[PDB]
Design a binder for this molecule. Sequence first.
Ligand SMILES: *[C@@H]1O[C@H](CO)[C@@H](O)[C@H](O[C@@H]2O[C@@H](C)[C@@H](O)[C@@H](O)[C@@H]2O)[C@H]1NC(C)=O
Ligand SMILES: *[C@@H]1O[C@H](CO)[C@@H](O)[C@H](O)[C@H]1NC(C)=O
Lengths: 243, 243, 243, 242
Amino acid sequence: IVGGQEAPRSKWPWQVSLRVRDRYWMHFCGGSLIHPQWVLTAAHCVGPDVKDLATLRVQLREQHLYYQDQLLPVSRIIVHPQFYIIQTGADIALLELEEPVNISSRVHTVMLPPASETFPPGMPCWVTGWGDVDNDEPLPPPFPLKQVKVPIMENHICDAKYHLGAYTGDDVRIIRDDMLCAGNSQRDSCKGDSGGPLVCKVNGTWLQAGVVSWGEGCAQPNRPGIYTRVTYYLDWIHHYVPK
Amino acid sequence: IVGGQEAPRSKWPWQVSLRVRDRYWMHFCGGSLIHPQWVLTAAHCVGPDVKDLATLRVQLREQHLYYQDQLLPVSRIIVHPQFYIIQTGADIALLELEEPVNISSRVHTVMLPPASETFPPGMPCWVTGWGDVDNDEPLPPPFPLKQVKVPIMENHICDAKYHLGAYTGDDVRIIRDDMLCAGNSQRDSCKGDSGGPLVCKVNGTWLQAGVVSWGEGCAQPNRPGIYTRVTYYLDWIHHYVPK
Amino acid sequence: IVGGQEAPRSKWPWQVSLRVRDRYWMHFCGGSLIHPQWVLTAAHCVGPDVKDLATLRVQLREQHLYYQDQLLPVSRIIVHPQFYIIQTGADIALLELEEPVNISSRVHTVMLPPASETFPPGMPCWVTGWGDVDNDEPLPPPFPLKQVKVPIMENHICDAKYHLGAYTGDDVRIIRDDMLCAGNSQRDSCKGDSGGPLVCKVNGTWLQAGVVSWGEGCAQPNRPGIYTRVTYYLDWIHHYVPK
Amino acid sequence: IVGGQEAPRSKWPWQVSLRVRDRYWMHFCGGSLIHPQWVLTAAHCVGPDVKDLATLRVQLREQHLYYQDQLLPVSRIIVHPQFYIIQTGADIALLELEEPVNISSRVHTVMLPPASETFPPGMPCWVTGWGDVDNDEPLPPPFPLKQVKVPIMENHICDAKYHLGAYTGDDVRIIRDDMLCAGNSQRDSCKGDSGGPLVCKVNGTWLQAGVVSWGEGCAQPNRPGIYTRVTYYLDWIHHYVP
Ligand SMILES: *[C@@H]1O[C@H](CO)[C@@H](O)[C@H](O[C@@H]2O[C@@H](C)[C@@H](O)[C@@H](O)[C@@H]2O)[C@H]1NC(C)=O
Ligand SMILES: *[C@@H]1O[C@H](CO)[C@@H](O)[C@H](O)[C@H]1NC(C)=O
């Protein structure tokens, strides 16, 4: 997370860390608890190929990575079928836990947004995670969970921004309707934050607007972070997660 | 180049090396002389952003990289406008040299194929470059130019391979018509070969069938290398390069 | 530590971690609390040059590195004067804390041996630390303190091991009287354990026999770890550390 | 080599590069041709342990590393018996080629100094090699052989310099008699240069004064580069080299 601060222990009870087996259970992406037995994340996190589930684990909200682990094995991995190698569309996936987790004040689900929520500019949102604090700059030990408020940028304005300084044709769309834009040259998510949540407060309630997906660099000028727009995949999500 | 051998001095007179300004003029991509004053290469090589020409140079056919350099500046770069970050389609670009090069038997252009050539399986083709000789294994000093014969795979068969062991839906197309597939688990191009040429011997003549673009891993099972199909972009190329 | 296991919380209350100011207070060496206000360590850890104390901190017994840090400033550093760059003899040093620490059962000093103790082969000894778990393999997160029982090898037998497969002359001494040897191809200390303690259980009491100093590789055949023999420097130590 | 320039093709005809097998014959140290069949180098280069000779090769003077290789296998490796792990004394070794090399204007031997030459301060010397051009900064391709003139620093003055900023006792010698000091914060040899030659011109003749050995950092303040003094090991060298 670029330009933020360490999150208080009571914030983001839905944040999860995904780990892969490599000398230790190493963090590679974030995710969010959207149902006691389901985790929402980015498809490219559990890609490219179909993964052996024995090499993957889920860690529920912990303030510091690795220290008080209570790894949870995964029962099923579901990746949106529109997703494919080298491409950013349909960057969304589901992880089914082998069993429901205990729900509490410190650990519980984040609400999915209603289909009509567009999360227009001005909406107060935050992205959280354990990723890098700047380009090629990893989060130092003890690995505290970080947060940062990021401004939303209307999709069309975002798409135009991504054309500033690029060879791409103005008439060629870079930012798609299933995406969402947030962040500036001071605040942003970054490598390691992928699959993590972007939440916005709407009339007192936290709603998950996006899933950390990609961006050109981190906190780079005219290059807001790009998230997968959750509302666009609610029907798909509801085909697996109980409402 | 994975699984090949050093190329004889008299072969591949159209191969070029692109250099970026670092502690020295470092090789980052390949390219090809398709006209005395024009180099064909991959859009992603001159990407992501609009490049400052002062940081780039072109090196014509040499047997070893850096040894007998005669660097050429670049007049302008033209990247296919349908090209964009994190997307592999329309991966093709043009470099105009400040001056036309002296054509010789040791250094001359490669012929582009007629729109009708499909380069079907069985065609004998070679891909050349100074890239990695295997996954995460760079070409070692003295950096000889390498070549490897690579089998062509029909687009649909190729598309089906890429769906093997992947979450992508069978109806979702991974390999597109502007693409071409070649290579196997023994022979292929790799990191650093990018933008280089795939040339096939057709009725006694060498024709450039493709530009090294991407692939999952290098020489990985059921994941042949993907090339930008040259015939698909002949009208665009001819819009800039004289006949 | 190579080949050991995580240490129980109630063991090695004298182990200390030394920290250097980087992107965080990074561990670089171990040390031991031999007096409420003094830490014993290796000269090469505080070498080669006179260190600026502002870049150094001491961390008393903790189960995991960085997690529950309570860093302590260092008042002064005293390196044995016979010590010098590229030489392994007299590798011993002292750190005076700014304040004496509160002694408890979870955190207290280790007893120094009497001048007469030779720590002969067969003695049960443990070496502890947060160093590499094998050659070029750092301790992975969450960085638990490790311990490993290491066999003692008599000085002369050790000296002869070190001449095996080496060009050094049989008459040229490699292991000196101020040294002690422990470890085998299965168990040993390694990079990062340096300055830490080798303690042996003698007649119901734990005595610090050595300070992790050097060795050829880690757990390499016929190359036991070399420690600074504590008894040899008792008069120097007592010239500074109260009784 | 720090602070120098690329060497002309006609200089240092005695410079050699030592290569170890690792994906390619990779340079790890330098050496010098002191006899048609013998190479002088540093002992720590052919250390830590007794090496399997099949993993080692010698390359005679090339302007650029790797490009026009003609690797030569080694017949025997002789390391001064006083040398041992983690210590810089007797840092000198000999490599016997399986056969004499052809001698020419471009490739030939460097003269060993007479026992009485002390190479006092003021003497014009150069150190050559393919090592790093600064700390943690490797020589970039095409890897040209570099050279640099380094000033000599009298042994005692050198030893005192190495005590500046260190915990070591003044009465404890750091720089020994079998060593020699040269360089300053602008000019010095460095990692990759080890085993290579330090030569000084004495009354028109080039003499090998030292073998690149060690130093604290590269071109660091009050830390001249340290070479093995050749004169000190002439008798040992003469037990093997005709
Ligand atoms: C030493 O010089 C002589 C004369 O210039 C060369 O012939 C040697 O080359 C070697 O011997 C010749 C006959 C031929 O076999 C060639 O391939 C050999 O390299 C040369 N010796 C060396 C090792 O360069
Ligand atoms: C769930 O909560 C109960 C009650 O506190 C506890 O006993 C049980 O172990 C918890 N399950 C997990 C997986 O922690």
